[PDB]
């Protein structure tokens, strides 16, 4: 039962790393391929000079 709880914790941390990195990468995507959401540029490389 302890091992089955530890397995659920491990699977939750594995899924949280996956979701955490997908969220992290959403900040780096260019606004042309993203739909109409107000993707205000975060990086200097995303601003039109």
């Amino acid at each position: 039962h302890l091992l089955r709880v530890t397995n659920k914790k491990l699977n939750h941390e594995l899924q949280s790393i996956v979701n955490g990195v997908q969220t992290l990468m959403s900040f780096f995507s260019t606004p042309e391929t993203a739909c109409e959401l107000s993707s205000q540029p975060i990086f200097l490389s995303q601003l039109l000079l």
């Binding site: 996956v18 990195v21 997908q22 990468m25 780096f28 200097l44 490389s45 000079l49």
Partner: protein, 52 residues
């Protein structure tokens, strides 16, 4: 003699204006390259990691 020294000063300042104009044109070109380099690093190196 002061009129001659002032002419030489005018020529030195004129050469420096030419150097600055050329330097600013180069800097404008370098800012454009740095923007493309940063975007290319994000596309080629960062965006693939979620699949792995």
């Amino acid at each position: 003699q002061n009129i001659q020294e002032a002419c030489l000063l005018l020529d030195k300042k004129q050469k420096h204006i030419q150097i600055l104009i050329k330097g600013n044109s180069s800097s404008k070109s370098q800012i454009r390259r740095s923007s493309v380099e940063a975007q290319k690093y994000v596309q080629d190196k960062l965006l693939p990691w979620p699949q792995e």
